[PDB]
Design a protein around this ligand. Structure first.
Ligand SMILES: [Zn+2]
Length: 46
């Protein structure tokens, strides 16, 4: 079921932690650190 209302297009990079996107990679990268640098809550094993 494709109900693309908000986005779901022109995507190149997506975070498999908070389903976030960034027009560019660099932007996403700096955002990844957060998920890959936060208190040990659970075994990410990404
Ligand atoms: Zn994220």
């Amino acid at each position: 079921g494709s109900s693309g209302s908000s986005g779901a297009g022109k995507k190149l990079f997506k975070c498999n932690e908070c389903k976030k996107t960034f027009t560019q990679s660099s932007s996403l990268t700096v955002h990844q650190r957060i998920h890959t640098g936060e208190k040990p809550s659970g075994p990410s094993s990404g």
